[PDB]
Structures are given as C-alpha cells and as structure tokens.
Amino acid sequence: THTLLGQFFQGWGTWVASWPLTILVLSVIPVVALAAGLVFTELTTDPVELWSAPNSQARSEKAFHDQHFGPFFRTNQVILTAPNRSSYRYDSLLLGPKNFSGILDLDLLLELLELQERLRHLQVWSPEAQRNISLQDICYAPLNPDNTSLYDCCINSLLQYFQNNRTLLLLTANQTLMGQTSQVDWKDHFLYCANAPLTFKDGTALALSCMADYGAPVFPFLAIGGYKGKDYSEAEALIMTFSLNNYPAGDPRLAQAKLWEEAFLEEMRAFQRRMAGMFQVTFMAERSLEDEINRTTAEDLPIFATSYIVIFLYISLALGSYSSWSRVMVDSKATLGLGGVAVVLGAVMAAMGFFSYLGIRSSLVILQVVPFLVLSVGADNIFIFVLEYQRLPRRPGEPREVHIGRALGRVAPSMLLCSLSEAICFFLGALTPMPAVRTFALTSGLAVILDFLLQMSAFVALLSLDSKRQEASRLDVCCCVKPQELPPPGQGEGLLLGFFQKAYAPFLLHWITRGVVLLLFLALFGVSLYSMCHISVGLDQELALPKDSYLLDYFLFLNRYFEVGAPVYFVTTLGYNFSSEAGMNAICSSAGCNNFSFTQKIQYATEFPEQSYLAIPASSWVDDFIDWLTPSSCCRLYISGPNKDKFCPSTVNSLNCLKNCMSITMGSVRPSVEQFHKYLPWFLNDRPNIKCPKGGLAAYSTSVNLTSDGQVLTSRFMAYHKPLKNSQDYTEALRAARELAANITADLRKVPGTDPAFEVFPYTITNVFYEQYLTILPEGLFMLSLCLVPTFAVSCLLLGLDLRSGLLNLLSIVMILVDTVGFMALWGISYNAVSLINLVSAVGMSVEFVSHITRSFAISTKPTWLERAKEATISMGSAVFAGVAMTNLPGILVLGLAKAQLIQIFFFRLNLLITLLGLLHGLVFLPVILSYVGPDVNPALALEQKRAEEAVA
Amino acid sequence: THTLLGQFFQGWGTWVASWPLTILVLSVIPVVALAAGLVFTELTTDPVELWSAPNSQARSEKAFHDQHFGPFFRTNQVILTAPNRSSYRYDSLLLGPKNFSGILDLDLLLELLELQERLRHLQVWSPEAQRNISLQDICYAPLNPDNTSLYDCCINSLLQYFQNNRTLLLLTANQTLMGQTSQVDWKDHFLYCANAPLTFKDGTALALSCMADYGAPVFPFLAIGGYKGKDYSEAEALIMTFSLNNYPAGDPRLAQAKLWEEAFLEEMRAFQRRMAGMFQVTFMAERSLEDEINRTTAEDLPIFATSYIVIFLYISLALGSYSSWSRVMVDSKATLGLGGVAVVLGAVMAAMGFFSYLGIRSSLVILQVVPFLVLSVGADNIFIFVLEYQRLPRRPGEPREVHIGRALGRVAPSMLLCSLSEAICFFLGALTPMPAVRTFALTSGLAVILDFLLQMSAFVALLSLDSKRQEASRLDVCCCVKPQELPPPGQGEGLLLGFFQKAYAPFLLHWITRGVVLLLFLALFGVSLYSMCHISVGLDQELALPKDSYLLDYFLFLNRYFEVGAPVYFVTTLGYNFSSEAGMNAICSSAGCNNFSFTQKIQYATEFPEQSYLAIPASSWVDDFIDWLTPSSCCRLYISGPNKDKFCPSTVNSLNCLKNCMSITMGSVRPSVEQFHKYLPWFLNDRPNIKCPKGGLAAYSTSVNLTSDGQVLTSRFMAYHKPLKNSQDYTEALRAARELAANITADLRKVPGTDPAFEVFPYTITNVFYEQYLTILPEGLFMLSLCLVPTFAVSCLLLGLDLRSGLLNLLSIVMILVDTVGFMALWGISYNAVSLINLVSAVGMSVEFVSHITRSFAISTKPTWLERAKEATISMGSAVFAGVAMTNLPGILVLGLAKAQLIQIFFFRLNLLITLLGLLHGLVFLPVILSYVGPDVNPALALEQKRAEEAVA
Ligand SMILES: *[C@H]1O[C@H](CO)[C@@H](O)[C@H](O)[C@H]1NC(C)=O
Ligand SMILES: *[C@H]1O[C@H](CO)[C@@H](O)[C@H](O)[C@H]1NC(C)=O
Helix, strand or coil, X not given: CHHHHHHHHHHHHHHHCCCHHHHHHHHHHHHHHHHHHHHHCCECCCHHXXXXXXXXXXXXXXXXXXXXXXXXXXXXXXXXXXXXXXXXEEECCCCCEEEEEHHHCHHXXXXXXXXXXXXXXXXXXXXXXXXXXXXXXXXXXCCCCCCCCCCCCCEEEHHHCCCCCHHHHCCCEEEEECCEEEEECHHHHHHHHHHCCCCCCCCCCCCCCXXXXXXXXXXXXXXXXXXXXXCHHHCCEEEEEECECCCCCCCHHHHHHHHHHHHHHHHHHHHHHHCCCCCCCEECCCCHHHHHHCCHHHHCHHHHHHHHHHHHHHHHHHHCXXXXXXXXXXXXXXXXXXXXXXXXXXXXXXHHHHHHHCCCCEXXXXXXXXXXXXXXXXXXHHHHHHHHHHHCXXXXXXXXXXXXXXXXXXXXXXXXXXXXXXXXXXXXXXXXXXXXXXHHHHHHHHHHHHHHHHHHHHHHHXXXXXXXXXXXXXXXXXXXXXXXXCCCCXXXXXXXXXXHHHHHHHHHCCHHXXXXXXXXXXXXXXXXXXXXXXXXXXXXXXXXXXXXXXXXXXXXXXXXHCCCCCEEEEEECCCCCXXXXXXXXXXXXXXXXXXXXXXXXHHHHXXXXXXXXXXXXXXXXHHHHHHHCCCCCCCEEECCCCCECCEECCCCCCHHHCEECCXXXXXXXXXXXXXXXXXXXXHHCCCCCXXXXXXXHHHCCCCEEEXXXXXXXXXXXXXXXXXXXXXXXXXXXXXXXXXXXXXXXXXXXXXXXXXXXXXXXXXXXXXXXXXXXXXXXXXXXXXXXXXXXXXXXXXXXXXXXXXXXXXXXXXXXXXXXXXXXXXXXXXXXXXXXXXXXXXXXXXXXXXXXXHHHHHXXXXXXXXXXXXXHHHHHHHHHHHHHHHHHHHHHHHXXXXXXXXXXXXXXXXXXXXXXXXXXXXXHHHHHHHHHHHHHCCCCCHHHCCCCCCCCCCCC | CHHHHHHHHHHHHHHHCCCHHHHHHHHHHHHHHHHHHHHHCCECCCHHHHCXXXXXXXXXXXXXXXXXXXXXXXXXXXXXXXXXXXXXXXXXXXCCEEEEEHHHCHHHHHHXXXXXXXXXXXXXXXXXXXXXECXXXXXXXXXXXXXXXXXXXXXXXXXXXXXXXXXXXXXXXXXXECCEEEEECHHHHHHHHHHCCCCCCCCCCCCCCCCCCCCCCCCHHHHEECCCCCCHHHCCXXXXXXXXXXXXXXXXXHHHHHHHHHHHHHHHHHHHHHCCCCCCCEECCCCHHHHHHCCHHHXXXXXXXXXXXXXXXXXXXXXXXXXXXXXXXXXXXXXXXXXXXXXXXXXXXXXXXXXXXXXXXXXXXXXXXXXXXXXXXXXXXXXXXXHHHHHCCCCCCXXXXXXXXXXXXXXXXXXXXXXXXXXXXXXXXXXXXXXXXXXXXXXXXXXXXXXXXXXXXXXXXXXXXXXXXXXXXXXXXXXXXXXXXXXXXXXXXXXXXXXXXXXXXXXXXXHHHHHHHHHHHHHHHHHHHHHXXXXXXXXXXXXXXXXXXXXXXXXXXXXXXXXXXXXXXXXXXXXXXXXXXXXXXXXXXXXXXXXXXXXXHHHHHCCCCCCCCCCEEEECHHHHHHHXXXXXXXXXXXXXXCXXXXXXXXXXXXXXXXXXXXXXXXXXXXXXXXXXXXXXXXXHCCCCCCCCCCCHHHHCCCCEEECCCCCEEXXXXXXXXXXXXXXXXXXXXXXXXXXXXXXXXXXXXXXXXXXXXXXXXXXXXXXXXXXXXXXXXXXXXXXXXXXXXXXXXXXXXXXXXXXXXXXXXXXXHHHHHHHHHHHHHHHCCCECHHHHHHHHHHHHHCHHHHHHHHHHHHCCCCCCHHHHHHHHHHHHHHHHHHHXXXXXXXXXXXXXXXXEHHHHHHHHHXXXXXXXXXXXXXXXXXXXXXXXXXXXXXXXXXXXXXXXXXXXC
C-alpha cells in the first residue's frame, strides 16, 4: 500500500510539475474565493457565550431560574482601603472599648458619601435613545420596582446605615448611662447597626433608623470587609455596590446599562487618580471582564505577524545551498520562502473565511492563535519535501518534472500521514463542550486540511517554476535580472548532513552514550509519571486577563478583604404543595416544626464552612411568612367599613382594623389553604415599617413566582458562599452545594403531594463556567485515548510500518505525552479545556517527530542495526530537525509576548514543552531504541520501491 | 492553446485511468456529502413568493399599501348558472315589462340562501387551536371590526337585498298604481335595488331595506353577472363572495383562514355534486391556486423518472458493438450506461443538496424540470467521449491508460467548451427578476458545472475499469460470471459510420441537393423572421394549472359572466395638506369645485373603458365628506347638556342636538382646519342610517390612515377595472392606470403645500405579477445578446477556430434562435421569464450541435472542400446525432405527459423545437455552408497534434 501511495502521488506530482502556472491559478482562485468571507467575521465577547456548554445541566438550571425569577442582577463593586491610617482606641460606653480601624475616620466617609452622591446623578448621553440616561432608568429596585427615583435604587454601602445624610453623619448627642454621661457619635450607631441590621430604631440616645435608604436592610458583610468574626469596628476595606437590573441579549436597556457602566468606570478612574495619599481604590463592572479579555486581541496582533517574516527569512536561508559566495543570489530559495508563507497564509485565511460564511462567530483565541499555530504546524511538510527533492540525484536523461514527481512520490506518504494525524486529532479535540475551544479546534482542523490540499498542488507547481528558474541559472528572487554573466557550476555535499555525519551520529550511537540516554529517558519518564499526581485541575479566572489590567488588583482586594462570596439560590422547582401543613412544616426552622428540615439543614451546613461552602444561613420566605401571620399587628383586616375583611397596612393606626390577621393561637401559627392563598400576596407586598419589621417586599419580592390563580409555581432560598479564591475552591463549593441540595430533595420528596420530578438545585452566577472541572479528567483521558487509537491505527497502514515500528511509535507518543503532562504540572500550568486541546494537538504533532525517523529506519539495507540507526538519523534526523523544530520555534516563541496571560501561559509554554520534548525524543531516544530493539530489516521493502519509479516515469 | 488544452486533459486522463477505483471513491464521497443536504429541502408554494421580483416597484407600492391600510382582503367566490331555464316575461307595473332570466326563479334563490346560511355556521376543527373556528373569528368586517358575529361578516350576494330572510323572499303585497292594482313580489324590490343600491327604503308598496345585512351597500356587479348595461333582470349568473381578513405570513390566523378555506371548498364540492339538473356551480378560494399549481409536482414525478431508464437502455445498446450475435453479452456497455446515469443523478442531487444547505428554497419547476433537463443536456459529453475512444486505433505497444488519456486529450476541448457555454448561459439567464426562474437557472448552472467535474474524473475512471473488463474478455454487465469459454476475437467497421458513409454524405453533399437545402434554410429563416412579429408577450394565468383542475371552469365562468374585474386603489402617498381649501377642491367632483380634478378625471377616464381599463368611477371620501357636512341633520352638536358641542349621532331624535354640524351655507360647504380635524373622525365612524344615507363607516372606514394627532397620512380611492381576460389585457390595464395616476399626480403637485415626493399610484391585487411584461422584451433581447457575445468569444479561443469558422458558428446560433422564436410564435407559446430562460438554454445548447462539426471540418487535410465536408460530417455528424439528438429526445419527450400545462407548454414544446432545429441546422445546413464558404485548411493544424500525443505518452 505504501508503494501504491508513492506511485499515486508520483503520478500526480509529475503531472502538476508539467503544468505549473495553470494549476497555480486553479489553486489560487478558490483560496481567494474562500478568503473573501472575512468581511462576514463577528467576534463573540461575553464569557457566558465563550466559556459555557449551551446544552449543559448548569445552563438548563440558569435558563429555568432566568425564566421563573428573571435574570441575576449585575454588580458594580468599589473596594477602598486606608494604606497609612494605623488605628485609634474609642469606648462607646455601651459596648465597651473598641479599636476603630483607620479607614473608619469621619473625613474618609464624607469623601465616600460625596463619591456615592456624585455617582447617583451621573448620566450618559446614550446616542441610541438621544436622551440622558439616569441611574433610576435601569437600577435594580428590590422595593417599589415601578416609579423608580435616585432614592429608590440598590446602592449597598456603609453610608446606608445613615440613609446617605451629612447631618446624621455629623450628628452627636449626650447620653447618661448609669450616672456617667458621654458623647454618642455615628460610631455607636454603626456598632449597633453591624450587630443587628434589621432595626427601625437605634436606641442608644439617637432615634436613627438603621434600615437602608431604599428600605431593604443592608447586611454588614455587604458594606465592610477585612474583619474576622464580629469585630466590625476593625473593618479594613469599605465596599459600595451599584446593583443594576439585567436584561436578555436583545433588549436595548442592556446597551443603556453598558453605557452607564462605562461612565461609572470613567468616574471611578477620575476618583482613583484624584485620591493618592488618602485612599487606595479598586473597582469593576459587569462589562469590565468582557472588555478586558478582548482588549489585547487587536493591540498585540501586529507584534505576532513578525513570526511570518522570521519563518520566511529562515526558510529562504535554510534551503539555499551557499557554497560559492558569488552565486548566493542564484541558490538562495526566496521564491519557495514566499511560496511557503503564502500557502500557510492562504490556508488559515480560507479556513477563517469558510467558517465566517456559515455564520460561525470567531473569538480572541482564533485570531491570536490559529494563524501562528497552523504556521508552526504546516511548513514542515514543504520543508521535508524540498530537502528530499534537493537530496535526490537526478538520473541521466530525466526531465525535472519526473524528478519532482519522484521526490513527491518518496515523501508523500509521510506528509499525508502527518496532515491526517493532525486533522483527526483536531477534529476529535473539537468534542470539547466549550464553544470557543470547539470553534478553535474545528478552524485548526479545516486549516490543516486546506494547507495539505494547497501543499499538494500550489507549492509543487511553484517548486517546479523555482527549479525551472534555477536550471536557466537566473537570480535567486528577482528573476527579471537573469544570469549576472557566467556563474561557475554548483555542486555540494550539504553542510547539515556534513555536521550530522561528522559529529552527531558517531557521538549519539557511541557504545557508552546509548546506555546513558536510555537510563536518562527512563528516569525522566518515571519522574514525570510521579510528578503528574501534583496537577491542578481548573482554568483560573484572573489568569485569562492581561498582566496590566486593573481587575488583577480588584481580584487581589476581593480575595484579601471580602467576607462572603457569591450568593447561592437553593431554587425549588414546581410540583410542591406549599398550601399544605406538612409542606410548610418541612421548610421551617422555628419551634413547632419537624427536625432536620430544609432551612435547619442549611443552618447546620453553615456551621462548618470548610466542608460545606456556605458561610451564611438561608433567608426563608415561609419562616418569615409564619412569623408575619403571628398576632403582633403586622397583618390586620377591617372590623367594619366598605373594605370588609381586607388587609389594612401596618402603617395605618386607625381603630377600623383592630381584628388580628388570623384566629386564636396557642401552639404554632399554621394558616389553612384559604388563609395561605389569601395572605401570601399580602405578605409578599407588605413593605417593612417601624410598627413590625417582618415583610415580604424587603427580601422576598421576586423570591416567589405566583401565577394569576394564586398557586406557588417556584421559590428560591438565598444563602452566601464563603470567600471563594481559586478555581478548586469554586468547583468544591458547587460540588458541596449540589450534594447538599440532592440530600435536601431526598427528604422533601417523601412529603405527601410532592411531584416525583420536583428538584432543589443550588443556582449561582458562577455555576455556568466552573462546573466542567467536576468531570474534565474522565473526558480528557477518554479523548486522549480516542486520539491515540486512530493515530497508531492509520500510522501502521499509511506508512506500511511493521508491528515493532508502530509499537515504538505509540510508545514514543505515550512517553512524550506523559512527559508533557509531568512538566506541565511542574511549571505551574493548570489542566482544563485549553490545556486539553493543546495536549490533543501534541498527540497530533508528535507523529512529525517520530514517524519520519521510524520509516527512514524501516526502509534500509545496512548489514547491522547500528549502521541502519546511523544512516536513518543522518538521512531524516537532519530533515526532521531542520524542518519541524526550526519551523515550530519561530511561530511559537512570538506567543511569549502575548501580554494576555491566557495565551502566554496555555499556548506559548505548553507548545514550547511539546516542541522541545518532540525534538529530544524524536532525535535522541528513537534512534537509540531503534539501534537496540528496532525491527529486523528485509530486502523486499527497498527492492519494491524501484518497480514504482521507472514504471510511472 | 487548443493543443495545450489537449495535452493538459491527456495528462489528467492518462493519470486518472491509471488509478480508477481510488478516484471513483474520491469523486463519490463529495457527491454523497452534498446529496445528503436534500433533507433540508423547503418548497415555496405562494405565487407572491414565486412570481414576484422582491425589490420591484409594484412590490414597494404593495408593501406601502399593506403598511398604511392593512393587507388586501382574500375573496372566496361562488358562480352559479341555470343551464336549462329559458325565460319568463313579467311586468312590475312601475318599470314596465321585464324578461326575467331562468336563474332568477324563486326556488333557485331559496337553495342559494340555504347554501349561504349553511356556509355561515360552517366551522373547522383547527387542530392547532383545538377549538371550532367559526366565520366571525376571521371574516372581513367593513362595519364594526370588533365584536364580530355571523351577522357582521362581508358576504356579498343577491340575497343581501333581503338581509338573508326567507319571509322577505316569500313576501308579497298589493299595490294600486294610477287605479290598476297588482302583486309586488321580491322581483320589483330586486329591480328597484339594482338601479340604486344605497336606499334605506324601497318605496314600491314594500317597506324593505335595500341596504345589505352587515350594513354596507351591495353593488349590482358584486351579486349578479352576465347582463350588458342596466338590464339586471337578464342576469345569467348569481355570485357569492365570502371575503376574509388577510394577515402576514407569520400570523396563525392565516393558517385558521386556510383551514376555513379548505372546509368551504369541501362544502362547495358537496353542493356541486348535490345539484346536477338544477345548477352548474363553480367556486375558488385564496388558497385554491397555491394548492392547484403544487398538486401535480408529486403525482407526476414517478412518471418522469422512467426517462432515466430509457436513456440507460439507449446508452447501453448504442455503445455496445454487436457484430457476432454470440458475444453481445461481452460488448454491450451496460457498466458505462449505469455509470452515465449515476453521474447525471449524482450531479443533479449534489446541486439540489448544496442549494438546500444554503437554505435556498426549491419550487415545482426545480423538482419537475432540473433532473430531466440536466439529464438531456449532460450525457452528450460522455457519449462523444466513448464514441471517440472506440473510434481511435490503439498504437502497437501502448497501454490502455495512455489510449484513454489520448482519447480524452482529443475530445476534452469540445466537452469543456459545451459545458462552459451551458454554465455561462444558465448563470446569465439567472439575472431574471422572478425568484423561481432565478433559483432554477442557478440550480441548472451548478448541476452542469458538477456534471462536467464528475465526467472528467468519475466516468473516465469507470471507462478505464469497463475497458479493463473488456480486455479480460468478461461478460457485458455481470463481470462475476467472467468469460463463457473462448469468445471469437471482435473487430468491426461501425454500422453508424457504415450507414452515414454509404447513404448520408453522398446524398447530402450531392451537387443538386446542396442548393435545395441552402435556399430552403434561407426561406425558412425569412418566414421565421416574418412570423416573429405575430408573438404574444406575457405568461397566461390559467395555463400554469393542470388540465383537470376546477379553476379552469371557474376562470371560464369568470371571463364569460363577470362585469367588473379587480378593484384598483388610487393610493395617494403622504405629504398632502387635505386640511386646506385648494387641497379638498382639487379632489372634488360636485359643484363649487375646480374643473379636471382627481375624481372628475377618473369619472372622465371611465367614459371610454377600452382606452382606459376602469369600468366604474372612484368612490371619494372627500366628496362624501363635504356631502356629509351639508346641513341635512347627519352631523349635529348638543345645543345644551354635559356633552356641549359634541357629535350626537343621526340615530338619536332628541331636541338636545338641533344645532347643525357647521355654520350658514350659501355657496359650497368647505370646512376650516379646526372643522376638518374635528369632523373627520366623526365622518369616518358615522354608520349610515335611514335619516341620511351618507356615512364614512360604510366604505371609507380603513380608506383613510389617521395618526393620533388627527393629520391624514395617506388615503386610497376605490375604482373597478373592466373584465380583464388575457395577460395582455391586465398589462394594458396596469399601463393605462399608471399613465392616468402620473397624469393626476402632475395636476395634484401644482397645489400649494404638496411635498414634491407626493405620488398617486394605482395599486391592485394582481399588479405584483403582470408588471414585468411592460419591460420584458428589452431585458430579453439584452440578455440574449449578453449570452451570444461570450459564447462566441470563448468558442473562438477554446476550440482555436479561425474567424470564418467562429462567424459561421455565431450565424448558425443566431439562425436557430430566430427559427425557434418564429416557430414559438407560430405554435402558440407566449413569451415570458420561462420562455426567456428556455431560449437562453437554447443559446447554451446549440454549441453542442454546431461547434463539434465546425471543429471536425477545421482540423482536416483532404484536398478539396467537398471531401473535407464529407469526412467531417461522417467523423462527427454521426457522433453529434447519436449522442446529442438521441440523448436530448428521451429526457424531453417524457415532459409531454406533464399534466401541468406550464411544463407541457413551456418546457416540452420549446425544448423539442430547440432540439429538432439543433439537429436540422447542425447536421444539414452547417456541412453544406462549410462545403461552400468554409475556411481554407492549413496543414499546421493537424501536424501540430502529433507533437502533443507522443510527447505526453
Ligand atoms: C444631561 O446631562 C448633561 C451633563 O453635562 C447636561 O449637559 C445635559 O444638559 C443634560 N440633558 C438633559 C436633557 O437633561
Ligand atoms: C364544533 O362543531 C362540530 C360540528 O360537527 C361539533 O361536533 C362540535 O361539538 C362543535 N364544538 C364546539 C366546541 O362547539
């Protein structure tokens, strides 16, 4: 079959080389026709569309939550710090002596208030709507979602304990406690506020409302950070959150939100530049990450394009035999250099163009990796082809077309194998759930296919033309000048083969050396296979940003100073009869309720924050419901008048509704079905007031989805994760949450009237991204195995290699792959979808190092093993080194300047490791193991290649 | 260049034939990969999407009308007739003696009422909505568009003059007129109703309301037909119109309408079958045409597929040399037959599949024409190739691969030319504005391209395999049997070439004959060029339906019995100040108004219905407005009460609104701006009553588009075309309408305050389809010229023919094209987009008849012209006949059984004319004119072909 592939491609080659210009045109036309599709290019920017499997479990849970409770609100945080403010001890006289941190001075808070106020009235032009968009237009309103004003928006900060008032900030009073009088400043109100945030009266000789301005209580962990326990006075960082309403991707209100985000960021930059010796401000925005990941894609693309020039120059200098110093301008192959560069460029542009035509949207990874990775991969074929064509002695009375045909006939099977291996590996790597990596893998696959299809026709035609110009004895590049005069005839023995045959093969295959490299490589494999255990699964968050971003400093401050992570929502699906007694009983935490209930289980889970990643208990609407219906004059019906048995609000103080909400209470308050269905809309729409603090409008406004009938479809329970720092922490948090939710569902399903398809799932904002790393190692190992099977299967058929050769091929690919993973874990590169696609690219690439040497050893006729190993290395080792290694290095070493830590960490470093291990193995380890336990050569492998050359002449 | 093309394709051929199986697989894989896209096939059915240019003027006018006044209402007509009812003379005594037609008997009308009533309450299941859809859900409501009941729908019929009442139908009274008493039946009320349809009291001793049931007046021309003038009593056909509200393509209400249409059609079929000796009923529906054009596409596709079997058998029998009668099962080329059929089938399926993948929607024409037209066109290449390969004597010591290579090298340029000519012509024919013909032309173009690309590789590989089986001396088709025993060696001289050389060339190129055929063809061209003048431009309407359709009988009855065609809407665009005095003055018809105004001009235009296709004057809202504000107690304001100066309706008879609508009137009633803006919404929403008949709600409800401000955006004026029968009539009607509208706009623009972009355009329902035929002859002639230029230009470069040869080629193509148009006009085939694309296909095809003979004469070496003409004909005439003609006939003669008059008229007949003229010209006229004034042969055309054969051996 190998001989038939040789004959086939020889026939094709000798045809194409006979008709160069026509086939050049016939190959250029479709390339331009496909490359024309780059005007249809659309870049996806949102991390949700890039780093999420669309049909995954977390996405289904997100879609459900988004449908039943609206989308998760956007958050625009600002974290301050006092760098050079030590402390000042102060006694409140009612909580004892307290050491107030430097950041909680008066002037610093007045400056924060000034900033907050200036940020409330801040507006954008909004050139779409042509009107000034104020905060009230788009801001998240937990209370009063309609008729929203600048005093009705979700602005969480320490200055919410004074409702954003300068007079209440500068307010002092005199309090006599057990005979001794002292001054009560804002400090005592803050100290009282931090311990119990849901109080309408302070009660420390100051009638100050601890409740927030917008009218829903602010928790201490949302306004201050850096403390440990309940020593809030020692808070090291103030926090300020301008929460905004989120919309689907179609709504222009989202574009208006993004514009307000941009103006917020601008104001925050101005404030950061203003305060130098006072504050150390860091900020973010919902659009910040999307803008930061896609900033460097354009700023660093021109710097990468120089790799093409470096490879052009290298190819031009590494194929031209300069052995006269008078005809260097006749032998330097600049035409083939331009050819090779134009071929790769055509291939990558055609691939991108074709994928743009189908309306498949590109990304940062595609534009920044594909043109250079495909360039590193797709020059080696041509390089080996030209080197073989140069090394072939032309038979007497043979035209150059048949000579080029014969050269292509010799090195076609190896090139086809390498191309097919790379293509297959990329198209199998494309089974990743991440759309970004999927698109990237498919692009690289098609690019390699088109590259090979161009290398077969376009480059062969151009080599035929270049060779024709050589035969006419005309200038190296500028053929128009023609022969200078009478260049002396050129014949050489090769400098590469010279150096190799003199130095390398004698030194490498020395009796002493072979043992040294064999024990060294066995030891290296052993160390690698040990060091594999110290791997870190999961792509990091801040490591996908540029190294000069402000989000780095923000995430530093977040991970350092914050006290609770993202809020988890234990969303209860439909098919639960909450109108029952046992239904409400099994969600309850208070007395007169069953043991180990929903909220009791969450309350118990949050006891050990290490083993279960919840640092705050669940805020349950049903417990606060049964607490609201307690006869404490919260809910009241009219004893007389036109509105008989209708809810009089807690705010009215008239006698006309002195009737309690429900009947006599001796045990536990449990409403009947009618009571439940009647009182639930009254609970959910009762704003909390001074007369009684319980109310559904504060926290549980949109936490229960009610139909027009009055039945509860679905309800969500709010809990806060502990501060999550690493990708491991978040993965462990998701896993622990899911486990707890499943455990809770197991107890909820046993209640009578529960639909068996009823489920509780712990939804968060960062569940869509970090859920893959639960099940990435099995998928990864399966994919690498499914890539290593067909590579070897096809390598043992295309080349026609013996079992011993194919087995050593597979062993070499396994050894390099394990070594790569070992050094990956050793460097400090994590394992994820990007590392996975690069390891699959490594499986695809390693054949270019192994197969050529293996084949060159297989097809031999030297008497003993050592002479075969010697000649095989010299014949191919030289070709494989000069081609593969020195075309891989220029295209990859440029990605070291990426400035986007994602690329610079996961592409440059990993591909460098793969290329150097490829070189080491395929040049040092393979010749020695082939010299030792290589296959037994038979004459009927080389004497069958002559029936293929003259027969198809 | 011809010699280089020969060498190129020789090299390709000798390569492919050396690797048959691999290239067969490599050519089959993409064909199946593209053919797999047939599961994405979507058929367009609506004539609006098939037979309309989307970006045309009429479509822009339609889109505007649809936006500003809603879409044009659907109409479901029913036309009755009394076949065997002579007459009965009857005197009303108030209109004199009248001859009542047989159809206006009592019982027939009672049966029509019964049908109408049964059709009102008729409902569909509607499996989408799962509820019984009644008429009132979707029916067109001119009065009271909301709260619609079965007594609030637009049901125009003769029984609207009695409000669909049995008692009023059977009502008689006694009237004494000038002393003499007589019986007054329904007949006198009908006679009074027909003359003046807008009367609320009859006034012939019967207090019967002549007004319709729904409450808008029914015109005599909408309820009765067959009369001529104002002799309505002699009506020969009753009419019944269930007008339905139209919706855009997205609305499910359209699907509900279509379901009601289907149930209406079912009921009407039941009624037609019921009444045999009483009525002769024909009906239609808005969905009827869409359902009738796309009925035969599936019922007649299997009958067409037999053409493939006929061509398979013909090819199998016409390539196998049977000259032993013992090895007929060794020489009959069944493998090549299956090959050729599989090639064409692959090509057409790949084309359809590729065009289905891009989401381009197919049609009836594609599925019913493409597979068979492409089959007729795309077998000739292969046929000529095999015939040349068979006729070539194999050189001693030459392998079969080089022999097949040489054969392909000989007949590649001609095949490439023919393919390129056909492709170019189809891709230029694709510039038609009709999307159906565009898609068809593009499909045929791509099909021909892929066919040629398959013929180059797949068929050459299969011929190499078939030839290999022949060399091994194995059975014709079932190669598994192998040689029967010892078949005697086969060598022959050809029966075709035998018959040709013995009979044809001596008889044709006889000294006497040549003059006869030359004068005959000159006379034929002359007659054709004369008969071209008697052409009929425009595709007919009913000729696109099957010959067994009910719509044929319906259109017969419509064209026979109807009195007014479709209603024209003189839509006035925005930028007109109707609130002015001169604004209302220039639209007025009544006294106190300017001469030659809008409606006066329409009223004058409808005087001569022949020269201007309007048979009814315009119903103007402004004239009826200024008539409504006349002090005749139609509009009245409250003299006192809470509703001071507010419109009291005409229906109230109280004293509280005795104040007239406007001030004192001595000259002409002309409202001021305030009066206009205040009274216009009162006019448009005043239902007509007995007290005064004028009112805007009757006819002008949706005839004026008013904004929330009160300004008139746009307004439309209703006029009726005269009965339009032919495509010519409709074209002439559109042209006359457009001309009149432009003339009216010329006078309207001169009024002060008119925006210069103000336009009046006469919109109708059938304006979108029949508007092309205004400007189809220039487009057609331009397209044929733009197709004849590059054909000749490429024919003079690819073949390398001399000027004399190329000129005779162009002359022959022009002569056949003129002859085709002559015979087209003579048969009775109209000229349109379908005839145009077929004539462009003829321009593309005719090269297959002309070029081969021309080339075969050009490349010769016989001493005198006559011997060259003789040998050229025999060498190629035989090849061209046997291939082109006898592969064109089987694929085309099957379309004669189309049963869809569109295909059977425009494809079968036209392609038959083209094929027979192609045969006649390319076999009789071309050899004789080449024998007379052919080019002077030079030896350096045949002695340059030997430097190409052994050189590339
Ligand atoms: C909106 O805000 C900008 C702030 O500079 C101001 O100039 C502008 O006048 C404001 N426009 C409106 C419409 O309020
Ligand atoms: C609708 O009409 C059909 C006529 O047969 C009748 O059977 C059915 O009961 C009707 N359904 C309703 C919902 O009125």
